[PDB]
């Protein structure tokens, strides 16, 4: 929960009714009703889990609302659902080939659930006891654990016994031990040995003693992609790329070694497969050889279902000397179904800039409302979004809590859009630097 | 031995930037980078300690945590084959299976021989009775670095050059 | 119940001593190319050629790659088959004639028999004994090992050599574990302790696993498939040692490597004795390199050297260009984006579209292959959606007519979901036509 | 004793409490308009509520852009994070650039921890450990000149101890939080046990054994980041050597930054941590790739994405990377939409030469007002840079010859012996042989 | 190991005066570049003189590679032939003239002769001494004939390779001391009260007799690289597998190629020069080129022989169009052979041949018809149609192809001309350069 005010953070879900239609104004999003229908529609195609590798084009003008579905469909989505939102141009990497990092974001989307049984004893040792034997081939030993309510008496085992040795417990740390996956932690030291040894050291951590009951019961569910398989049988210790990104071009024999015992856990019934979302924004930024990739990738059985968002005409396609239209090749198209997203009016835009007025916690006026919808229907809407949250700064500056529409004419005249700075620049064109490097540095002559 | 190139240091820098003394937070955001702000600490991340626990199925969720702090040439030397348990995502793939398989197996066995083809061509091609044809021009240890009148730097190059594990 | 764009194809669907028939195996339609796909097969399972390229080519939605999943199908997944894309070849780690030659000797199988003496089971005793006349300076001198090993009905002690008592003190064999011996290693190797021990401790590590059945003593008959680069990948990186580089490079990343034509040539010739010993045989198998006019010039001079090759498999290529420029050069024109030096070193197969009735069909077949109803009205509006944009289009828009039939609670689609799926979802030549009237960029 | 490199005399913006810039203030000579939209832009970070909120500002060469950010630098003040960055840095050969901007875009986040600084020093008098082959607490006494104390210790401190071979006479560091042990070297009470020894003698300390310090940490999510990624492993605090396989920059995944800011926000909703957002300031923006450009849209619409600051000096111009996509300020249009542009305009002759005097005073100068005319008319006829950087100059031509006075003289000579560019370019035209 | 494309090639068919028969050792024809194949394959086998460029040029599916091939063949074993393709130099590890050098000194080998001892005997007794951690390995091992007996000195390795394929005191076994290789015998003793642990199904063999350790000269050839990448670093025989031998130092060069010399002039080692084989060779840049035309000069350089196909196309890396593709630097400095396209009849016997190869039995319309669309469309095409109509008459279940196996491998398989009409013919179909294309039928 480390986020500030977004761009789009208002929008939680897509509003729509339990017959697949949009609300006009609900969980954050306005207007956009065959868009948001066909989202739906999509997000109900990822929740029944039974149809794969679909690609899906979100095309329209830029700011409409492509990258705002994708987000209400990432929220509707809810938790424990794979869902990886990339730029087009994340793929373009130093270490790893186009392909590789395609495959990499594919299999980041379709993830397995786990579920396990922990019976948890978490508590503080009261004294643990070390019984040399003469023989020294078998160790036995009793763990006197304790919360702050009981505390039992647990035979150990020679396996424990070597297993806490290693990460060295000193009568007093809290632990915690699995019963039937024997597993062990150490979290630290409890607070009442704090003012025991005078000095901490490096490799320890002061933690609460546990209350309540010693042993608990609990079952966690694990949603593990196909890439942490991948990463993690790629190498011995693979947590490390896991977390640091230098998996470095995986073979496609573990791949298919992983795929097919995959299938055989969801065979037995030790795992099920949760599908998800593949997002991949600003779609017209990839080569010619990525788009192959795409296309054929996209028939594989463990594919996820793929959103694209494009914002280009009939624009040229990257790695090619051709125009095409979305900036994407005719047989990606082919496999494909496009949902186009319509321009806004007054009333559309007066709706969105008052949501993102209230998701800011910024009170406007009527009037300066009214202003900043005419703003937002002459120059684009987000530049009246920007120019909502400097009014109100300009506001607090004033010493005042309501923006008013001096507020908003003030923050029109400090800040230009694209028209009042381009026209500007064309005025004074001697003053920049233009595409031949000539500039007028001297005002005078 | 010692090479004659001498990077002459002053003790200024190596008392105020690498020791940690009262007037500088070596140590405080050195504990402050690698235990309190880890994300393998169980006391404040067990949830992803155990997710990976579960991935590897390492019998200890602290492993995690003293992997990502330990040199990786030490961490090379001090790793020793332990048990993990078969509840767990990483299995054994084929090739690896045979490489463990075919460890002290005899000759004439099909799955030794055909994993033993750099060994058969050395003993084929009569390669340890060679003769050495290259030799270096220079051979020079590394650069000395002294710090005059500090006695620290010199246990710690010591300690750097000939470390005894 | 998970279906991506194929699996509605079962093999190609030829009958013996004949030809195709129209709708057999999933496929409608494309007699001559499967009856062309089904020589090649035949031709596969000969196991007699080496490197034979095959290039079939089309327009898209013509079912190349169905063509082609379709041989894999037909051969069995005993015989290998590496499905691969030429945006595959363009690797940053290595050049991409070696990726080319890591991907052709994945396509090249081996088929190992072994037998195996193994003696396993939870171990009932465990006595080191001593010689008669012990040497002096030394203590415990062993004549023989006496391990006990029991079993599911029955149980047999062993007479073991001496030196195995250094392994199972280095294993750490304890009384009541499970282990396995093989015979002519040695090399012990316990599983864990069995499941009668397993409520002794509250606390434990290691796994309970269960007691082994079958008698203690066995022979099994084994048989491994492992490729050609499985070999040159396990024989590159070497045994597992005890030296630091080794297990540096085991706790770093496998990095891939420009495998020399020498460990290649060794490989080959120790496959080539065994084959002759008469253990190990060879399954060679496809290789399919789809869209092949991704590639560059540079991959198909090597491609033409390395289809000469003596263990090259079978390399099956697709593309839907016409004449159009090879990539790598400014001046090349040449038919499906293949130059024609490549060109005369395969045969290539012709795939032709389909009429309005097989469109039929195939919808008909991909509807009833995603466990979905349709009408008879809808199905003919779907078939003319088909072949007047599409089939592409109108394959993919049967699971949306699903989702709206199952929103409305019927478990039909009819005209109207199919009227609402496309007024919700645009095809490329409708998209096309709002791009060229709008100009909002 | 000061140096001053073509700023430092930009104190800040120069506002009042209302935000209405002065004509002369902090150091900066008019500009009003663009010095009430940066204190706008200040009053937004110091918000601290909205994330990803990017301005551009854009105008001629040598108007002021990279002295305005300056000023919100100096404005904010040395605890909010600041990321100075020029548009080629970008470009890593190491890493892709996408995962550079990333990693700027999070060195602009920044954090405060409070923490406590204990430190236990002086010479060792008594060092007895007490066993039960494994030792299980250390009596350590340590004695400076304000008395003695004596602490318990856990083994792992023995063990840094013998690691360092502290032996008793020993003076040494104990940091009682981290755990860290310096040993400065052996007292002067044992320095003539020997006439001569290898050891070196450190005089016993005259302060307190026991010594408490509240300070302040400053990190931020990229050095977290990079301390929760090492590719190769974790070093000790002292190590003069570094590792034998080189570490180089990864394409750190987005987990492991979920992580990190799952557990800052586990520390924060203790009180123990406090965010403080920053800036990332982009200078030359239009040098980026369109690759970067592209990157920049999907990046300013995070959750914890800092105030992003770009300027530009082009017009009419080429995004790099495309073709024929013609742009303003060579910033594409679906960013050029997400921002808020920033006019800064040329000055006159009176502006030139009050910011020329300022410059000579902020450089201990003194300048003849018949010379500060001749340097004002010499920037409205060539530029404001040459006549800023012919400053220096003139004050040592002045200086070898025996003055404290910048006269027309020494203006001429060294408008005489340095040329501008357009100088230079005429004798370049009228030249033969490369100039 | 399988049915190639010149699997039907053992030699060029040449006759003691270098004249080459009609139709002889799988190659057909050709005869000026079969005469002059000989005269390289002679200047090769001689091996005086060093650095001599050959390059093959004529139209596509000619017998170019077919003659390099045959070259290879009737160049017999031990000496080093390296056929390397155009596109093999453009490496992310190597730079283009180290992977030049490596192809060049791969082509060069070095015939050492060693002195061994074969030590072969009965085991009587084995004594091997480790340490607690098994580090350090010595003992003696006491190995008997029926005439003599002998006590050795065990080291580490000797041991390593003992307790390997293990020998227990009464196997007959064979030690190559300058190899360190064991190879067990057999059993000879067969002991009654064996530990029932392993396969106990040895060979019985007899004690060997005579002399328990006899002296032999063995020979074994190195090339010039594998000795490179071995003194190049401290594991360099595992890089002799893996090719991790980045950009190899000079130093390491002139070296090695002293201390071959200095091989030479002791009578240890002899130099055997071999052929380099660069196929494809126009794709290579002119900086390959010009690093060849400075190669092709030293005294360790091979018999260069190249083949391309182009006419007068453009060189790689520069910006004209040059004969074959090859600068005229390069050309000056190489001797061309030129090979000549096939008439009906040389055609027809190519396509005997390759049936006889493939174990395929044609009737003699049937070769006609191969023959006449082997004229008509080019012989690679015609040469593929072979196998293919082969198993469509074991389809049809006789084994015999007969004429309409042809034709129908004719109908179903396409060649390139029929290809290109129908891609003409049906332009809207197919995606074209400016990637217009009609997925639609109506
Ligand atoms: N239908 C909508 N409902 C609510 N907010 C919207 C809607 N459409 C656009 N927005 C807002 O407009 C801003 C810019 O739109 P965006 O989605 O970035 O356009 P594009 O998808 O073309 O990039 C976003 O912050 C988003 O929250
Ligand atoms: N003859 C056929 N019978 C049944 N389905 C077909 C047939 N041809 C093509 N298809 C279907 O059409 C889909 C797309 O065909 P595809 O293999 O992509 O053609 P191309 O590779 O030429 O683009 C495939 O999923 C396949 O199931
Ligand atoms: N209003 C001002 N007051 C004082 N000095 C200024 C003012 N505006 C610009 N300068 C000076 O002029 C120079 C302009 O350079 P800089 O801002 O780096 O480039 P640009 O103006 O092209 O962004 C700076 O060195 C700054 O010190
Ligand atoms: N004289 C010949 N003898 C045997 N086979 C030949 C002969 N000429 C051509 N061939 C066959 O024709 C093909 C020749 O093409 P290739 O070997 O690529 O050489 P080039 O590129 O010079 O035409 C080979 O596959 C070979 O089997």
């Known amino acids: ?167 060295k417990v000193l009568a007093g740390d809290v632990i915690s031990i699995d019963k039937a996956s024997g597993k062990i932690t150490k979290l630290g030291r409890s607070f009442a040995r704090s003012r025991d040894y005078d000095a901490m050291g490096a490799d320890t951590r002061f933690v609460q003693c546990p209350e309540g009951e010693l042993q608990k019961r609990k079952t966690v569910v694990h949603t593990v992609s196909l890439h942490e398989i991948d990463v993690i049988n790629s190498r011995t210790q693979g947590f490390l790329a896991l977390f640091t990104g230098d998996t470095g071009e995986i073979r496609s024999e573990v791949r298919d070694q992983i795929n097919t015992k995959v299938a055989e856990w969801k065979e037995e019934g030790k795992a099920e497969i949760v599908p998800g979302v593949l997002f991949i924004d600003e779609v017209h930024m990839l080569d010619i050889e990525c788009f192959s990739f795409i296309n054929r990738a996209l028939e594989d059985e463990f594919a996820p279902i793929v959103m694209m968002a494009t914002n ?134 | 031995s010692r090479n004659p190139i001498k990077y002459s240091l002053p003790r200024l820098i ?60 030490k961490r090379v030397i001090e790793r020793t084959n332990g048990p993990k348990n078969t509840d767990s995502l990483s299995f054994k793939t084929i090739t690896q299976e045979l490489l463990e398989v075919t460890r002290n197996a005899p000759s004439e066995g099909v799955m030794a021989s055909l994993l033993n083809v750099e060994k058969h061509a050395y003993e084929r091609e009569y390669l340890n009775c060679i003769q050495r044809g290259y030799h270096p021009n220079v051979s020079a240890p590394p650069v000395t670095i002294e710090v005059l009148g500090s006695s620290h730097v010199t246990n710690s190059i010591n300690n750097e050059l000939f470390d005894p594990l | 119940t998970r279906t991506a764009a194929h699996t509605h194809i079962k093999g190609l669907g030829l009958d013996e001593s004949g030809v195709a028939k129209r709708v057999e195996g999933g496929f409608v339609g494309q007699i001559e190319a499967r009856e062309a796909c089904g020589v090649i097969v035949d031709l596969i399972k000969a196991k007699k050629m080496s490197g034979r390229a095959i290039l079939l080519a089309g327009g898209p939605s013509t079912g190349k790659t169905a063509l082609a999943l379709a041989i894999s199908q037909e051969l069995g997944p005993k015989v290998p088959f590496c499905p691969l894309v030429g945006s595959e070849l363009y690797s940053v780690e290595v050049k991409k004639t070696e990726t080319l030659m890591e991907n052709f000797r994945r396509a090249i199988g081996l088929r190992i028999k072994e037998t195996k003496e193994v003696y396993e089971g939870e171990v009932t005793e465990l006595t080191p004994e001593d010689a008669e006349n012990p040497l002096g300076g030394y203590g415990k001198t062993i004549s023989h090992v006496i391990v006990g090993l029991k079993s599911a009905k029955g149980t047999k002690t062993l007479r073991l050599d001496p030196t195995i008592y250094e392994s199972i003190q280095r294993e750490k064999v304890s009384i009541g574990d499970v282990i396995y011996i093989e015979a002519n290693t040695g090399a012990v190797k316990r599983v864990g302790r069995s499941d009668a021990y397993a409520t002794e401790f509250d606390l434990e590590t290691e796994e309970y696993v269960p007691l082994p059945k079958g008698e203690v003593h066995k022979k099994k008959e084994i048989v491994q498939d492992v490729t050609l680069h499985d070999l040159d990948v396990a024989n590159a990186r070497p045994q597992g040692g005890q030296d630091v580089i080794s297990m540096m490079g085991q706790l770093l990343k496998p990095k891939k490597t420009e495998i020399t034509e020498k460990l290649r040539q060794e490989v080959n010739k120790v496959v080539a004795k065994y084959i002759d010993q008469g253990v190990a045989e060879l399954i060679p198998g496809v290789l399919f390199i789809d869209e092949v006019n991704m590639l560059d010039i540079e991959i198909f001079t090597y491609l033409n050297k390395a289809l000469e090759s003596n263990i090259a498999p079978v390399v099956v290529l697709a593309s839907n260009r016409g004449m159009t420029t090879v990539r790598g050069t400014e001046d090349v024109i040449s038919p499906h984006g293949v130059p024609p030096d490549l060109i005369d070193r395969l045969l290539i197969v012709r795939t032709l579209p389909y009429d309005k009735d097989e469109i039929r069909t195939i919808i008909e077949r991909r509807a009833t292959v995603e466990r979905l109803q349709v009408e008879s009205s809808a199905l003919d509006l779907l078939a003319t959606m088909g072949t007047e944009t599409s089939l592409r289009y109108a394959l993919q828009l049967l699971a949306p007519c699903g989702i709206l039939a199952q929103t409305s609670n019927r478990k039909e689609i009819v005209v109207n979901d199919v009227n609402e799926a496309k007024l919700l979802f645009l095809d490329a030549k409708r998209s096309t036509k709002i791009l060229e009237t709008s100009a909002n960029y």
């Open chain 2, 14 to 73: 190596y008392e105020d930037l690498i020791l940690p003394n009262y007037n500088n937070d070596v140590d405080i955001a050195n504990k402050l980078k690698n235990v309190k702000f880890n994300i393998f600490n169980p006391s404040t991340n067990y949830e992803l300690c155990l997710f990976l626990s579960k991935l590897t199925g390492e019998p200890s969720l602290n492993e995690f945590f003293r992997v990502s702090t330990t040199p990786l040439l």
């Open chain 1, 1 to 167: 929960s480390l986020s500030l005010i977004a761009a789009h953070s208002h929008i939680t879900g897509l509003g729509l009714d339990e017959n697949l239609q949009p609300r006009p104004t609900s969980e954050g999003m306005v207007g956009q009703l065959q868009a948001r229908r066909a989202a739906g529609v999509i997000l109900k195609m990822v929740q029944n889990g039974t149809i794969a590798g679909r690609a899906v084009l979100v095309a329209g003008p830029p700011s409409t609302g492509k990258t705002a579905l994708a987000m209400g469909v990432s929220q509707s989505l809810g938790k424990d659902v794979p869902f990886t939102a990339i730029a087009g141009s994340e793929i373009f990497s130093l270490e790893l080939s186009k392909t590789e990092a395609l495959t990499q974001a594919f299999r980041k989307s379709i993830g397995i659930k786990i579920k396990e049984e922990t019976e948890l004893i978490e508590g503080e040792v009261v004294e643990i006891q070390i019984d040399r034997s003469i023989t020294g081939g078998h160790k036995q030993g009793k763990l006197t654990i304790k919360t702050t309510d009981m505390e039992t008496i647990y035979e150990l085992g020679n396996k424990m016994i070597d297993g806490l040795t290693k990460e």
């Open chain 1, 312 to 445: 280009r005409g009939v624009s040229k396609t990257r790695g090619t000397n051709y125009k095409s239209p979305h900036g994407l090749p005719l047989d990606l198209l082919d496999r494909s179904i496009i949902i186009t997203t319509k321009s806004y009016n007054e009333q559309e835009i007066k709706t969105i800039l008052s949501i993102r007025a209230q998701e800011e916690e910024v009170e406007l006026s009527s009037d300066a409302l009214d202003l900043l919808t005419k703003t937002g229907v002459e120059t684009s809407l987000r530049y009246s979004s920007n120019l909502i949250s400097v009014a109100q700064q300009i506001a607090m500056k004033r010493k005042n809590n309501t923006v008013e529409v001096e507020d908003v004419k003030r923050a029109y005249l400090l800040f230009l859009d694209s028209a009042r700075s381009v026209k500007y620049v064309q005025e004074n064109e001697s003053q920049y630097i233009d595409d031949q490097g000539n500039v007028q540095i001297s005002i005078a002559k």
